[PDB]
Amino acid sequence: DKKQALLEAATQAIAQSGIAASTAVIARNAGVAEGTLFRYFATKDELINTLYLHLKQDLCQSMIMELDRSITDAKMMTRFIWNSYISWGLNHPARHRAIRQLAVSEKLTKETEQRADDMFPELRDLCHRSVLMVFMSDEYRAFGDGLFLALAETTMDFAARDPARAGEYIALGFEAMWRALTRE
């Protein structure tokens, strides 16, 4: 009931306006008082963390259901996961506009990031196997994730605008990202 409605409103409002989406606005759009929102979530940051996990779970389920586990070559496995990733974002654009902003907000706790990484162990493992070491470090991992998110967002935008060439934007985005971020 109202927990879900609050997460839907925060999805719509964060997609519409970014993190600095007003909790008054989100509460209003969920049809309760702002005091009720702060009863369900101790702080705005708690609400951000919870919404990120809910959206990440939805994305990870979608990618997992498409996984061909006979594939073991790192690049081919990552290509097919990328396809699934860009497809989810084209199919759920508000969810995706909500999630990418939470990901770079620097508001996510280490526990949340860790739970998010654990939602899809094969992808977590493939990062360890293939991403340039500097982009797995504590100092530069956020930057490597921002570069990735930037390349995936651009690919989604070009594919959504021009569906006839979506496949080709997805393939050219993937090869560019793989050259940008992976072991040489």
Place this chain on the structure above:
Amino acid sequence: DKKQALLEAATQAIAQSGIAASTAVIARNAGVAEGTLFRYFATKDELINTLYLHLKQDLCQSMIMELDRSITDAKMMTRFIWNSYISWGLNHPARHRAIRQLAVSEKLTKETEQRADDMFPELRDLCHRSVLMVFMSDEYRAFGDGLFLALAETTMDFAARDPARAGEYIALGFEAMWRALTRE
């Protein structure tokens, strides 16, 4: 001076809201009526094209003033141009955010695209020498441009948020971009 007021306000508005920025908002922010805005620019698309050339010319004049012709190695010259590009965006974050939204808008005329392309000859010809075929193509050059501007904006935002490590973000952003977009 109203024309310059209107271009400055359109920059701030497009940085914030993309090309869906409101002409009513832009005009009110410049201190003029919307009808006045349409006396200077008869369509929103004319405002978009004029602003894009004004911002591009500013950025290119900045890079040309910084060009060091002692650098005779192509990748190194491209790196130092990159450093000037990132520095311009860190000095002028709304200008670069607006240029990126304008460049990827599908509203620029062929005339505008031709004028932009020949503002900085050394750079135009470094691109022709270095960029992957497919990102020079009629079909996919606009996507190559989108990927570059996404990588550049990412680098700017990290360098601005964490200035202690700005040089390292600039260098890692450049190396990622070079691998993404250039030839064997």
